[PDB]
Amino acid sequence: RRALERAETLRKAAYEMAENQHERAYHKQSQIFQGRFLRKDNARCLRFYKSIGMGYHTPITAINGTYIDKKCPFTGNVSIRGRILRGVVHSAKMQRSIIVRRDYLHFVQKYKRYERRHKHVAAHLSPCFRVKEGDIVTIGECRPLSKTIRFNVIKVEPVSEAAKKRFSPF
Amino acid sequence: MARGVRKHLKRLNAPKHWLLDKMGGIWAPRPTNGPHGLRECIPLILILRNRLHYANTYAETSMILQDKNVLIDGKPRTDPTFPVGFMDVFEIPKVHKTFRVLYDVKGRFTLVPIQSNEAGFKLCRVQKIFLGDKGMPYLSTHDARTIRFPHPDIKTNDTIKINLKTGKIDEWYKFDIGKIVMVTGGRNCGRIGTIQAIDKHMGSYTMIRMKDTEGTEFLTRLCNVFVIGNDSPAVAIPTTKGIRPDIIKNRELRLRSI
Amino acid sequence: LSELEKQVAGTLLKLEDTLYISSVKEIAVDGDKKAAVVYVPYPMLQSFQKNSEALILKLEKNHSGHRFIIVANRTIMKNAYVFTGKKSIRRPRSRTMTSVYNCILDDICYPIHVIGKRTLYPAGSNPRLQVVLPKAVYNEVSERTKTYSAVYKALTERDTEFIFM
Amino acid sequence: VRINVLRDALKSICNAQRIGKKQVIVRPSSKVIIEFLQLMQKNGYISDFAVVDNHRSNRIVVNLIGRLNKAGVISPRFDIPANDIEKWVVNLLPSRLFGHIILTTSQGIMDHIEAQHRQIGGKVIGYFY
Amino acid sequence: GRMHSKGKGISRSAIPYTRAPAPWNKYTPEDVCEQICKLAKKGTPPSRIGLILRDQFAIGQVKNVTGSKIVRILKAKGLAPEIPEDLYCMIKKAVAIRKHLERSRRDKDSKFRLILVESRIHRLARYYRQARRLPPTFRYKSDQAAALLATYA
RNA sequence: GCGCUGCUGCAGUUGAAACGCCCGUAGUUGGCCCCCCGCCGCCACGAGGAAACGGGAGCGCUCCAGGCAGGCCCGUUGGAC
Ligand SMILES: [Mg+2]
Ligand SMILES: [Mg+2]
Numbered sequence: 006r007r008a009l010e011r012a013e014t015l016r017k018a019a020y021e022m023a024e025n026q027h028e029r030a031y032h033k034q035s036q037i038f039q040g041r042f043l044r045k046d047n048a049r050c051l052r053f054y055k056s057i058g059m060g061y062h063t064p065i066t067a068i069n070g071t072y073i074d075k076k077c078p079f080t081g082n083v084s085i086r087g088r089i090l091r092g093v094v095h096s097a098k099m100q101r102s103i104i105v106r107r108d109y110l111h112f113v114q115k116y117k118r119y120e121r122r123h124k125h126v127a128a129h130l131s132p133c134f135r136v137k138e139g140d141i142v143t144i145g146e147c148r149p150l151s152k153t154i155r156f157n158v159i160k161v162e163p164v165s166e167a168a169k170k171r172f173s174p175f
Numbered sequence: 176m177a178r179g180v181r182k183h184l185k186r187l188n189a190p191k192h193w194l195l196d197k198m199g200g201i202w203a204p205r206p207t208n209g210p211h212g213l214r215e216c217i218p219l220i221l222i223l224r225n226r227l228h229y230a231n232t233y234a235e236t237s238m239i240l241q242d243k244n245v246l247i248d249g250k251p252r253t254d255p256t257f258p259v260g261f262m263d264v265f266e267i268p269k270v271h272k273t274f275r276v277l278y279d280v281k282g283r284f285t286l287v288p289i290q291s292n293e294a295g296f297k298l299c300r301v302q303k304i305f306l307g308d309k310g311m312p313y314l315s316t317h318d319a320r321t322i323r324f325p326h327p328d329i330k331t332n333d334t335i336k337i338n339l340k341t342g343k344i345d346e347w348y349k350f351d352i353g354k355i356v357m358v359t360g361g362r363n364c365g366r367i368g369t370i371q372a373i374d375k376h377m378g379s380y381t382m383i384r385m386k387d388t389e390g391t392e393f394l395t396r397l398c399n400v401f402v403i404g405n406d407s408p409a410v411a412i413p414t415t416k417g418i419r420p421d422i423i424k425n426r427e428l429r430l431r432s433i
Numbered sequence: 434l435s436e437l438e439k440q441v442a443g444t445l446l447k448l449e450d451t452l453y454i455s456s457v458k459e460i461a462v463d464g465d466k467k468a469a470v471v472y473v474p475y476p477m478l479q480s481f482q483k484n485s486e487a488l489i490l491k492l493e494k495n496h497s498g499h500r501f502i503i504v505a506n507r508t509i510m511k512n513a514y515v516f517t518g519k520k521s522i523r524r525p526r527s528r529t530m531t532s533v534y535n536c537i538l539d540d541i542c543y544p545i546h547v548i549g550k551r552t553l554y555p556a557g558s559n560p561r562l563q564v565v566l567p568k569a570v571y572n573e574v575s576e577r578t579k580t581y582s583a584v585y586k587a588l589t590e591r592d593t594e595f596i597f598m
Numbered sequence: 599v600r601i602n603v604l605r606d607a608l609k610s611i612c613n614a615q616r617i618g619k620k621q622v623i624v625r626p627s628s629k630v631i632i633e634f635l636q637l638m639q640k641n642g643y644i645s646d647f648a649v650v651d652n653h654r655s656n657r658i659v660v661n662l663i664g665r666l667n668k669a670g671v672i673s674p675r676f677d678i679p680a681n682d683i684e685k686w687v688v689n690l691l692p693s694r695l696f697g698h699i700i701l702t703t704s705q706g707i708m709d710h711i712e713a714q715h716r717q718i719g720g721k722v723i724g725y726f727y
Numbered sequence: 728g729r730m731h732s733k734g735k736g737i738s739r740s741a742i743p744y745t746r747a748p749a750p751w752n753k754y755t756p757e758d759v760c761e762q763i764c765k766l767a768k769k770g771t772p773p774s775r776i777g778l779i780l781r782d783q784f785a786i787g788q789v790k791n792v793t794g795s796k797i798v799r800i801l802k803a804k805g806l807a808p809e810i811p812e813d814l815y816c817m818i819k820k821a822v823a824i825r826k827h828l829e830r831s832r833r834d835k836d837s838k839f840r841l842i843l844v845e846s847r848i849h850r851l852a853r854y855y856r857q858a859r860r861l862p863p864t865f866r867y868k869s870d871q872a873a874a875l876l877a878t879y880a
Numbered sequence: 881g882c883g884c885u886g887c888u889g890c891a892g893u894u895g896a897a898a899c900g901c902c903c904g905u906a907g908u909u910g911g912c913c914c915c916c917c918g919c920c921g922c923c924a925c926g927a928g929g930a931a932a933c934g935g936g937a938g939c940g941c942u943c944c945a946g947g948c949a950g951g952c953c954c955g956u957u958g959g960a961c
């Protein structure tokens with residue numbers, strides 16, 4: 006029965022999503038062929054998803070979701086390749102994007118001491134994640150998505166609002 | 176930025192292992208594209224002039240080659256800059272000299288004289304399996320050779336035996352623990368040993384752990400590990416069994432030789 | 434399942450005119466006299482401790498040949514945190530090595546309170562600890578300091594010696 | 599506020615020795631102090647000491663026998679390469695024959711001679727002679 | 728008197744080495760446990776509760792008997808106040824200074840003291856906001872301090 | 881030279897130099913304790929990646945500045961690291 010319930014939520018979404026006349030164009034997932042939604046039986050899968058790998062797991066939200074995002078790594082058409090890093094959220098005012106702060110250390114030989122530095126890194130945040138400031142995120146490298154963006158979020162641990170900011174290299 | 180490819184090569188910028196004199200001149204031979212790459216090959220002229228000494232200058236090498244006095248993998252070559260690589264076949268019937276090009280312990284090219292029983296085949300490393308036109312499977316080797324319709328049992332990184340006259344696979348040695356290998360890249364070029372362990376890191380290189388015949392252990396990445404048989408080399412190898420001595424022993428040997 | 438538990442339990446039933454013990458361990462001393470420890474379950478320690486002195490004396494008189502000591506059994510965990518990969522589990526502080534040993538020391542001789550501990554570091558001799566006890570009591574516990582030291586060494590590899598102040 | 603307990607302990611010890619006393623008290627009872635004192639005792643500078651418990655930063659008592667001339671700490675723990683020790687030795691100690699430099703390593707607290715033998719390095723705690 | 732002054736005395740209390748109860752103790756933790764409730768039901772701060780227990784009932788330390796502190800007991804019984812007592816008393820002193828100042832506005836020592844008290848309040852409130860002992864939304868403001876005092880008291 | 885730019889390693893009562901005093905954010909610095917789990921730094925080893933220069937093994941350009949030669953019965957002569 007579980008499959009039948011899922012299709013109705015998926016099938017229903019594509020309707021009022023069409024009645025959302027404000028949108029210039031009908032947003033759709035490329036892989037699927039529009040027309041399956043007319044099949045009364047659950048003879049075809051209505052949604053597409055993949056496995057990122059590297060030991061990561063596809064969130065249930067993407068599988069049971071109803072959104073469209075070409076740049077999402079699970080439901081879109083982009084791949085994760087290269088370096089995987091960790092950081093904290095600095096800003097989240099953008100539509101589907103954030104700014105990640107990274108902490109490291111620099112060594113000065115003359116004084117035999119260190120300095121604390123920081124950098125700002127922009128990432129694309131899929132609708133499958135809920136993130137606020139100070140959370141810890143894992144980002145994976147991808148192809149250029151914009152002028153300053155080459156990373157996409159794949160994981161995020163939660164944090165509490167009250168927590169004295171602490172220099173956190175990762 | 177140069178508007179095109181590079182056709183020269185300064186002597187001071189040449190690879191170290193070619194052993195070219197600093198005062199020889201400003202220029203050095205530039206190998207041409209072929210079976211092997213620039214940093215994994217050596218030109219013919221260097222072998223034929225700076226080692227065997229059968230020639231004293233560029234011109235003599237030109238005449239010798241254009242007269243068709245050298246065979247490479249059963250095929251005469253007339254380019255002085257033709258690249259010679261690893262596990263190749265060198266034949267000069269005029270003086271009945273047959274050599275297979277291998278690596279010494281110190282990390283330089285050498286000529287191993289051989290017999291007529293085993294000069295009809297060469298060993299090659301397979302590192303790419305792909306679908307070509309019409310979907311027909313293919314494979315490639317370290318010497319830029321393609322074979323159509325291989326056996327499904329053959330996988331990547333394996334080693335292949337092929338006749339010189341005909342590029343038809345005879346036997347293939349698998350890549351597995353407990354097999355003799357020859358290192359062909361980096362700090363450990365020329366060392367012979369047997370595999371002990373294999374550790375893989377996702378998305379990056381794969382490291383191989385081997386033990387020499389005398390118990391020495393060393394490591395390297397999978398991109399420069401070559402299989403040469405099952406527990407025993409299939410081919411004849413230099414006098415020493417792939418043992419890299421320490422500095423003390425080399426100094427002692429030099430003193431003895433002096 | 435040992436012979437000693439049977440007769441000590443018989444004595445137990447002969448005292449009142451409910452409470453049971455987990456196990457028993459006996460250890461010898463330099464003299465032929467041994468000492469027997471009773472591994473009481475942790476929750477019932479206090480109930481056994483209301484008048485433990487009377488019970489130990491009556492047990493000593495009933496069955497001679499070795500001294501009877503009563504102590505609880507505490508567990509020791511060897512990792513502050515646990516990394517299951519999902520959530521990290523904190524070990525409670527009561528299950529550390531140091532707390533258990535100190536509690537054992539206090540329990541070995543509860544009726545007489547310890548007024549101080551000191552560890553000495555000789556030049557070469559293995560470092561050792563000496564405790565401090567009231568002068569109000571001495572001959573009561575003077576004859577049984579060797580057994581206390583022996584049992585402390587047996588349970589805890591650490592050694593000790595006793596003094597009075 | 600109090601920060602480096604070891605520095606205060608060493609300064610008190612040196613001041614007491616200067617007027618030739620025999621027994622001293624040191625409020626902190628840290629493990630690092632204990633290992634420092636153990637090394638001093640084994641090398642033969644301070645003989646015996648005891649730790650006095652109180653549930654509130656135990657106190658420690660030590661005995662003196664002369665011999666010791668100086669002892670200090672290095673406030674920011676540098677990193678000492680296994681092969682870069684002769685420079686510090688020459689800069690800090692009076693002679694290469696005697697003296698002990700304390701380094702904390704992954705193998706525990708030891709002296710510069712021991713680490714030189716094992717060809718490993720670490721961080722520096724202090725010195726005495 | 729160090730954080731916002733120059734003096735440095737050392738008047739403190741030194742609790743005993745031994746954690747055991749007195750040999751004349753005749754109370755099981757229950758008797759003390761309900762006594763706390765009765766005093767709590769009368770709007771008594773924990774410190775006064777401890778003084779009352781020590782004086783009338785001759786109990787030097789509660790932890791030695793019940794194995795727990797007073798505020799932990801109150802919280803387990805769901806009677807602990809929402810604002811910790813020290814911050815509340817700080818706010819009381821601030822309010823009293825503010826009222827005395829509104830009465831007359833030529834005294835400057837009072838303004839100096841008020842500045843110090845507000846600084847201390849802000850520091851402590853930040854610390855309590857961390858550790859999740861107070862809501863993040865909690866904020867101390869000069870103009871509506873008395874309301875938060877009375878409503879939460 | 882210069883410990884007259886002072887990380888190692890300057891001076892600050894009187895020679896030049898402690899803000900008139902308090903609060904206070906960024907910043908820097910933070911007592912003691914858990915015997916083994918994860919993470920950061922840290923130390924050691926290793927891979928990988930240009931030579932020349934520099935260090936350095938051997939060779940009597942008549943020595944040397946240099947060069948990688950050279951002898952006969954040469955480690956596969958050597959040019960290691
Ligand atoms: Mg201050
Ligand atoms: Mg003070």
Ligand SMILES: [Mg+2]
Nearest residue numbers: 894895896897
């Ligand atoms: Mg002046």
